Each structure stands twice: as C-alpha cells, then as structure tokens.
Amino acid sequence: KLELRLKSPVGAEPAVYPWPLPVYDKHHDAAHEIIETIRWVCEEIPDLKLAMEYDTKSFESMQRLCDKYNRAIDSIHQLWKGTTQPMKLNTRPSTGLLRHILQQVYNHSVTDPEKLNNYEPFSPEVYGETSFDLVAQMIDEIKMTDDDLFVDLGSGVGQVVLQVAAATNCKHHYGVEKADIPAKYAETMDREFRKWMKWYGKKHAEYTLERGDFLSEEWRERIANTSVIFVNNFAFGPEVDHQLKERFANMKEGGRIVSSKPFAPLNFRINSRNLSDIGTIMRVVELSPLKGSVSKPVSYYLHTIDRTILENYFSSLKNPKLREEQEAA
Ligand SMILES: CC(C)N(CCCNC(=O)Nc1ccc(C(C)(C)C)cc1)C[C@H]1O[C@@H](n2ccc3c(N)ncnc32)[C@H](O)[C@@H]1O
Numbered sequence: 294k295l296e297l298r299l300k301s302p303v304g305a306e307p308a309v310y311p312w313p314l315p316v317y318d319k320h321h322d323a324a325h326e327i328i329e330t331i332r333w334v335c336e337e338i339p340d341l342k343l344a345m346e347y348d349t350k351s352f353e354s355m356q357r358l359c360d361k362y363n364r365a366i367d368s369i370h371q372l373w374k375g376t377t378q379p380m381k382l383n384t385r386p387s388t389g390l391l392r393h394i395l396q397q398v399y400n401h402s403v404t405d406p407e408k409l410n411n412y413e414p415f416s417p418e419v420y421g422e423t424s425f426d427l428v429a430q431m432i433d434e435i436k437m438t439d440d441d442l443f444v445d446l447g448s449g450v451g452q453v454v455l456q457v458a459a460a461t462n463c464k465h466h467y468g469v470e471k472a473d474i475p476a477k478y479a480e481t482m483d484r485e486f487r488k489w490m491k492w493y494g495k496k497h498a499e500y501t502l503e504r505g506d507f508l509s510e511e512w513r514e515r516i517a518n519t520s521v522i523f524v525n526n527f528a529f530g531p532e533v534d535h536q537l538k539e540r541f542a543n544m545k546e547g548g549r550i551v552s553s554k555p556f557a558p559l560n561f562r563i564n565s566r567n568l569s570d571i572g573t574i575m576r577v578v579e580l581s582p583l584k585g586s587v588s589k590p591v592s593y594y595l596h597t598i599d600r601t602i603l604e605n606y607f608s609s610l611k612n613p614k615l616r617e618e619q620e621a622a
C-alpha cells in the first residue's frame with residue numbers, strides 16, 4: 294500500500310489518501326483536491342506561500358509535492374514556536390476557502406452523488422458553481438446577527454446550511470430534509486465538515502441538520518420563530534407554495550425569506566378583495582442578479598415581514614377622503 298499525507302496547518306490529524314488517488318466524480322478527484330488544499334493553506338499563511346519556492350498520475354511527482362508542503366508546514370510550526378505569532382485560530386474562512394472546504398466535505402461524504410436529485414434551476418453537473426455564489430451574495434446582502442435563527446427549507450445534504458453557518462453569527466442554523474438518501478448523507482456531511490474545519494483551523498456557528506417535513510405541525514411554530522429563511526422554491530407547485538404562505542403569516546416583524554420565486558407580487562396593491570393575502574404583510578424586492586450566471590440571469594427575491602403595510606390600509610379606511618379615493622376603482 295502507498296499513501297499521500299498532508300499535514301494540518303494547526304496540528305490536527307493529517308489528511309491521508311490512498312494511491313492510486315481516488316476519482317470522486319466526472320469533475321472531481323483526489324489529486325486536484327490535494328493540489329487545491331495545498332493552494333488554500335498557502336492563502337491562509339503567507340510565509341508558507343513564500344516558502345513554496347506536476348504530473349498527477351506520477352506517484353513520485355505527487356509525493357514530491359506533498360513532501361515539499363509537509364516540510365514547509367514543519368518549518369512554519371517552528372517559526373511559530375519562536376517570537377513570531379501563530380495564525381489566528383478563532384476565525385471564519387474566506388469565501389474562496391469555504392468553497393474548497395465544502396467541495397472537500399462533499400467529496401468525502403456524498404458517496405454516490407448521482408443518487409441525489411438535481412436542484413432546479415441549477416446545472417446538475419456543476420456542484421454549486423453558481424448556487425454557492427448566490428448564497429455568498431445573500432450572506433453579504435442580508436445583515437445577520439447573533440439574535441437570528443436561520444433555516445434552509447428542504448436542505449438536501451446541507452450544503453447551504455454549512456455555508457451559511459461557516460460565514461455568519463446567527464445563534465443557530467437549521468436544515469430540515471424529508472428524503473432518506475439526502476438526510477443520510479447530511480449525517481456524514483456534518484461529521485466531515487466539523488473535521489475539515491478543525492483541520493484548517495477555522496470556526497463555524499452552531500448548526501443542526503435534521504430529518505423532517507417543513508409542512509409538519511412541529512415546523513409551524515419553528516417557522517414562526519425563525520428570522521431568516523432560505524428556500525429554493527422555484528420548482529414548487531402552487532399547493533406547496535400556498536401552505537408555506539400560511540406558515541410565513543406567523544413570522545415576527547422583520548423576519549426575512551429569500552427565495553427563487555416570489556411568494557407575493559412585487560407591486561402588491563392592497564384592497565378589499567386581497568385583504569388576507571400574504572402581500573398585506575411583507576415587502577418584496579427582486580434582488581440584484583449576479584453577472585455570469587445563466588439558468589437571463591438567476592433572479593431571486595427578498596421578503597420582509599412588515600405589518601405596517603396593513604396598518605396604513607386600515608388607517609386609510611377611517612379617513613373619509615382617502616376612503617373615497619380607494620373607492621374610485
Ligand atoms: C452529480 C451530482 C452533483 N448530482 C446533483 C445533486 C444535487 N446537487 C448538489 O448537491 N449540488 C451541490 C453540491 C455541492 C455544493 C457545495 C460545493 C458543497 C457547496 C453545492 C451544491 C447529479 C443529479 O443530477 C442528475 N444529473 C447528473 C448529470 C446530469 C445531466 N447531464 N443532465 C441531467 N441530469 C443530470 C443526476 O441524476 C442526479 O440527480
């Protein structure tokens with residue numbers, strides 16, 4: 294048996310790979326994961342990048358790369374023992390590193406990715422090469438603080454929950470998934486994610502990947518108490534979207550829902566016939582699309598619970614002037 298090992302930059306257990314190096318799918322294999330890990334650790338640590346003064350099918354050539362990386366790591370650990378300051382260990386991963394870490398967690402967790410169903414509207418042979426970016430855009434645009442609770446509704450193997458948990462301060466992040474196959478992989482994604490984040494010396498916020506149905510009664514109260522919801526509802530039917538509207542109607546003021554299809558018209562106009570529709574209690578905006586993203590770019594929608602829309606309508610009805618105007622129609 295032959296092996297390649299990469300040392301952890303913070304002294305966790307080394308990553309070990311058998312030779313020949315495994316292929317994970319049509320676009321991912323262990324040789325590129327190794328090269329990319331080396332590259333990313335070099336971004337974490339300048340002196341390492343400096344000190345790194347390649348045929349992926351030659352063992353010797355790949356061992357010469359690993360050896361070189363490992364010797365460089367040893368010398369950086371020595372440097373840290375001296376007066377030099379160690380790497381800050383309390384930090385979150387940059388977006389780029391997080392993309393790599395999640396690909397790596399997915400590689401080791403999702404043993405047969407063909408079993409998982411494609412998430413419309415994204416490409417099926419792409420592994421989040423745009424969904425990852427959209428979520429990244431949202432993480433930046435949506436201020437989240439430690440008083441927030443986050444849910445991804447229908448969370449698959451947990452790819453979005455783990456991204457968001459790596460990046461934000463929400464008190465807790467949840468994913469709820471209904472199907473056996475994705476739920477089982479989520480169990481492993483969790484394990485591998487905790488392990489690889491330790492390996493790179495990075496922190497995440499608390500999260501839980503749970504098995505459940507988000508239309509169940511247990512999730513009624515839980516949706517009600519969530520302040521940020523992500524849901525890729527583009528392919529949902531009108532019955533399921535309707536049931537979600539019922540749940541969203543119980544959210545607290547300021548609650549936010551980001552979706553791929555809006556749950557209410559963007560120019561909702563409140564009157565006697567639409568008094569009970571969800572548009573009476575939320576602002577809806579079309580978010581800024583991300584250049585370099587086909588499906589015409591991917592559009593996405595932010596809803597904010599705001600009952601003052603409804604308060605003003607009722608106040609307007611008490612005013613006989615405004616009341617007469619509305620009765621123009
Ligand atoms: C091969 C994998 C990626 N699989 C998609 C599984 C769901 N997507 C998913 O997990 N994306 C994802 C994965 C990782 C990340 C992170 C990087 C961790 C953030 C982010 C997003 C393939 C599914 O699409 C189908 N598929 C594959 C190729 C094919 C085809 N050319 N045309 C039609 N459908 C096809 C296949 O039947 C499976 O249902």
Ligand SMILES: CC(C)N(CCCNC(=O)Nc1ccc(C(C)(C)C)cc1)C[C@H]1O[C@@H](n2ccc3c(N)ncnc32)[C@H](O)[C@@H]1O
Nearest residue numbers: 412447448449453470471472475506507523524525552553
């Ligand atoms: C397409 C959605 C619905 N989902 C994707 C899983 C990965 N998460 C994901 O893509 N999140 C996400 C990505 C991007 C965005 C934005 C772009 C920001 C809008 C928002 C959210 C699919 C999973 O949801 C599950 N699902 C569907 C209904 C069902 C149910 N009632 N309770 C439990 N889980 C259920 C289904 O079994 C799949 O595993």
